[PDB]
């Protein structure tokens with residue numbers, strides 16, 4: 001059972017801007033996704049301070065970066081709070097309509113695409129390097145779901161019968177053919193050191 005949804009006009013506009021605008025500094029996508037993972041980990045950490053049972057679904061708070069050259073995918077896994085089905089459908093827990101408006105207003109006032117995260121829609125920077133994005137998520141209060149979009153104005157949501165993940169979010173980037181540098185260990189290390197060196201959770205870069 002796959003459900004197909006249309007993106008709200010503003011998000012479709014945001015995604016088309018990210019995909020079609022000439023902008024060479026694409027590496028910021030990884031900073032933005034690690035930042036989202038850090039935010040999700042902060043949320044489960046805070047909830048666990050008053051209710052330790054929230055961590056029954058996994059006590060480890062971390063971020064894993066997994067490149068796969070054969071599948072041409074870069075996966076970002078975290079053990080954060082995860083998202084309910086409602087949150088996934090409602091623009092992956094973001095204020096994407098107002099955020100997109102504020103980001104568009106900023107771009108007109110001199111901002112550049114790298115400032116996207118300041119407007120709460122950093123997730124969509126994944127489309128700087130990915131032709132398709134799959135998001136697998138599990139929140140303590142709901143089932144495991146898979147969201148997917150190749151942009152083009154729609155996304156799908158389905159129950160995930162894949163590997164159970166306990167709690168958190170997995171962002172699978174199906175990279176564009178000319179963006180395979182983001183599968184190279186030295187390139188990923190360089191970006192993490194440049195943009196995410198002080199993130200408060202362990203970031204483990206897997207090897208193949």
Ligand SMILES: O=C(c1ccc(O)cc1)c1ccc(O)cc1O
Pocket residue numbers: 033036037039040041043078080081082083092093123137168169171
């Ligand atoms: O699961 C989330 C998330 C992020 C923020 C928040 O307030 C609640 C859930 C998530 C969303 C996007 C992403 O790239 C990574 C993630 O862990």
